[PDB]
Design a binder for this molecule. Structure first.
Ligand SMILES: CCC/C=C/C[C@H]1C[C@H]1CCCCCCCCCC(=O)O
Ligand SMILES: CCC/C=C/C[C@H]1C[C@H]1CCCCCCCCCC(=O)O
Lengths: 109, 96, 95, 89
């Protein structure tokens, strides 16, 4: 039993790290915590490693786009890695990654 | 037309895939026989874990039995049933 | 079934294109400073056996396929870009 | 040409043979069925020939290759131990 319907297209509403110049946010993660918020928004905590040692980042994602501060990043496409058996291993990437040239980004491992 | 990123990633990720394996690799003490066919299709862990520190390896195996023509030096030939190992499930885990 | 019968084994093993998961570095060997995700791709390639040391299984029709791959230049930038790969569509056993 | 065929006649010395098999591209395949493979000729029917090829047994024929390459084996190949035979390549 786990939170269902995480696969799909989501938009960042808030994130706890500075994504400054970033346009391409992507990765392959088992979230440290995933929470359904009152209204159907999702909050993800992922425990990563910024500019050195290891930190936990929270993001709140919504099915509705807010013309806002994350526009360069674009919609976040999320899919379960179905060949990782069952459960909670996801791949994601943002729309800003679709570019003929490299753009500033992060890959979460 | 272009294969989209999520489709490539899901298709290539570590899982069991039909792999053509030379029977002499499975039966290396029988390299004095001739087998027909000389290779067999076996489900084996394949694909990528997308992290140079991880390797795609089996977690569950099973046996499959196949009729093979076995040509024995100076003793004639026959179809004989030969058993082979298959992978049913795979995982990505540390190398070393 | 209990056993895969002989003619089925022979038909399934005999030289033909088969889905193969190929490391991107094998196809682009000088791009070893990049990290690709995924790191391998599914390509149809001639495989199986010709059962006669006089013969090798080789392509007679090939096609190109384009796939979106995340190409990472570490500490520089990343993006999904299109990469071309060669596939095989038809094979034969030749001398 | 796939299916079981029983041998009616062929231009070969059966001798002690019990297991006939191989992988062939026939030169010809006319009508019963004559097959010609270099040279070897053989005739075959969906019907039996009492007491003559009986040790060799029916001949099972299947087409190989993805869209005139056949493989075949005789029922006598279906033994737990090796038996006299040949592989026609
Ligand atoms: C279940 C969905 C898995 C997660 C999907 C997206 C959630 C992870 C949030 C989206 C991006 C993750 C935050 C990116 C970290 C940026 C790091 C930049 C930096 O510190 O320099
Ligand atoms: C459509 C293909 C059907 C093919 C039928 C060929 C089967 C009739 C068999 C052909 C017989 C050839 C036997 C070779 C002679 C045996 C002697 C060899 C030896 O041991 O010295």
């Amino acid at each position: 039993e786990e939170i269902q319907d995480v696969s799909g297209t989501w938009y960042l509403k808030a994130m706890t790290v500075d994504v400054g110049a970033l346009r391409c946010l992507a990765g392959s993660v088992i979230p440290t915590t995933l929470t359904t918020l009152e209204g159907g928004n999702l909050e993800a905590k992922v425990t990563m490693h910024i500019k050195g040692r290891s930190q936990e980042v929270k993001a709140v994602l919504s099915k509705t786009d807010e013309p806002g501060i994350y526009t360069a990043i674009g919609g976040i496409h999320v899919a379960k890695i179905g060949r990782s058996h069952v459960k909670d291993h996801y791949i994601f990437y943002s729309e800003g990654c679709l570019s003929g040239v490299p753009v500033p980004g992060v890959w979460l491992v | 037309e272009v294969v989209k990123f999520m489709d490539v990633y899901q298709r290539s990720y570590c899982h069991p895939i039909e792999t053509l394996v030379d029977i002499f690799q499975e039966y290396p003490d029988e390299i004095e026989y001739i087998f027909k066919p000389s290779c067999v299709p076996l489900m084996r862990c394949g694909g990528c874990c997308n992290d140079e520190g991880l390797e795609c390896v089996p977690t569950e195996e099973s046996n499959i039995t196949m009729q093979i023509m076995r040509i024995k030096p100076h003793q004639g030939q026959h179809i004989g049933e030969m058993s082979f190992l298959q992978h049913n499930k795979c995982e990505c885990r540390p190398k070393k």
